[PDB]
């Protein structure tokens, strides 16, 4: 997609292999915010959103939280508290063409700035003076979208780049997306290091005698800590007891 009208897709009910992207030497950049790029395979997400567009090389740096500029303000914006990875690579042999590829568009101006994850696909003529435009370009009347005109011989800052942004959503909600991990057998009445569909801790697991409502995934105590969990393969409830300790 053109950056002014960026695409979005949801990723769910799957195994997310992140090493396949991280260790791919074809990427020009792979920057993660809020998470290490090498720990992604060990994490679970509610879901993952993949945003996708083409931009010019000199403006790749605007696809980041806290940034300003023509893309950051009028085409695609990430929030200051963004959690996710921005991945990009050169497409000079795909998107650039002789005479210029004018199909990819960007918004150069707008009445006001975008909020995070907004999209503006309006074709309304922008007034930049006192006289109403009434849909016609001329002095003080301009159409807001510009073409890139990408060409094979442009210098690198003017070459096209393909950008994919993976936004990671984290909630108490059961993870619908997890990395390529293998399960183990469940054991009881031992002190273990555990991970239940992304929820971790150290403790002793026992069978509970309490009832969860059909939609509840885990429970908590008075201190708001994890009290119990629902096993993801066998839908049974286990209680978590801290491993014994004391002074000597």
């Amino acid at each position: 997609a053109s950056v002014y009208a960026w695409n979005r897709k949801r990723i769910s009910n799957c195994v997310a292999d992140y090493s396949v992207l991280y260790n791919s030497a074809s990427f020009s950049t792979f920057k993660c915010y809020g998470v290490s790029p090498t720990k992604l395979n060990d994490l679970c997400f509610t879901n993952v959103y993949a945003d996708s567009f083409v931009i010019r090389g000199d403006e790749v740096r605007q696809i980041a939280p806290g940034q300003t500029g023509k893309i950051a303000d009028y085409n695609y914006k990430l929030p200051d508290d963004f959690t996710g990875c921005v991945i990009a690579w050169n497409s000079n042999n795909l998107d650039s063409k002789v005479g210029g590829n004018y199909n990819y568009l960007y918004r150069l101006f707008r009445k006001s700035n975008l909020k995070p994850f907004e999209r503006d696909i309006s074709t309304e003529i922008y007034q930049a003076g006192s006289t109403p435009c009434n849909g016609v370009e001329g002095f003080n009347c301009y159409f807001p979208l510009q073409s890139y005109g990408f060409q094979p011989t442009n210098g690198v800052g003017y070459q096209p780049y393909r950008v994919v942004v993976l936004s990671f959503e984290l909630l108490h909600a059961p993870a619908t997306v997890c990395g390529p991990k293998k399960s183990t057998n469940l054991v009881k009445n031992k002190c273990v290091n555990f991970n239940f569909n992304g929820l971790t801790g150290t403790g002793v697991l026992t069978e509970s005698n309490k009832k969860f409502l059909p939609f509840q995934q885990f429970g908590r105590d008075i201190a708001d800590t994890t009290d119990a969990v629902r096993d993801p393969q066998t839908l049974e409830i286990l209680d978590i007891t801290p491993c014994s300790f004391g002074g000597v």
Partner: nanobody
Framework: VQLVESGGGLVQAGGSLRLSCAASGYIFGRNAMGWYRQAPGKERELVAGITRRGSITYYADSVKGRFTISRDNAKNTVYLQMNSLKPEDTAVYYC????????????WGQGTQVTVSS
């Protein structure tokens, strides 16, 4: 910044002069392009412009009766045909986006001097 101007020179008032410029796709792809001029001691002004879509043209009042602006997408170029030039039209002419501005990363080129004598 990725623009070259040409076609300037000294002419006697009357007749005509052809100005032209070439642009990279980056600039040629802008919503509109035109010609600007700056006379010594004056502010730079837009003389004429042509849009990318619809080939809509418009002119400053001072040149409506004698200038024609056009573009040719095949070569990524823009032209200004200035007919019936008068001494008042002496200025440096520049090729730039109709919304030209440093705010958008634009730069002015060298421009070309057009001088019109008695």
């Amino acid at each position: 910044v990725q623009l070259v101007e040409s076609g300037g020179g000294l002419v006697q008032a009357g007749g005509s002069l052809r100005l032209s410029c070439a642009a990279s796709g980056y600039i040629f792809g802008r919503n509109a392009m035109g010609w600007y001029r700056q006379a010594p001691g004056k502010e730079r002004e837009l003389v004429a412009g042509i849009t990318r879509r619809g080939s809509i043209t418009y002119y400053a009042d001072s040149v409506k009766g004698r200038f024609t602006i056009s573009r040719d997408n095949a070569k990524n170029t823009v032209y200004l045909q200035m007919n019936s030039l008068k001494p008042e039209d002496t200025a440096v002419y520049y090729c730039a986006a109709d919304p030209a501005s440093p705010a958008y990363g634009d730069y002015w080129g060298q421009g070309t001097q057009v001088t019109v004598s008695s």
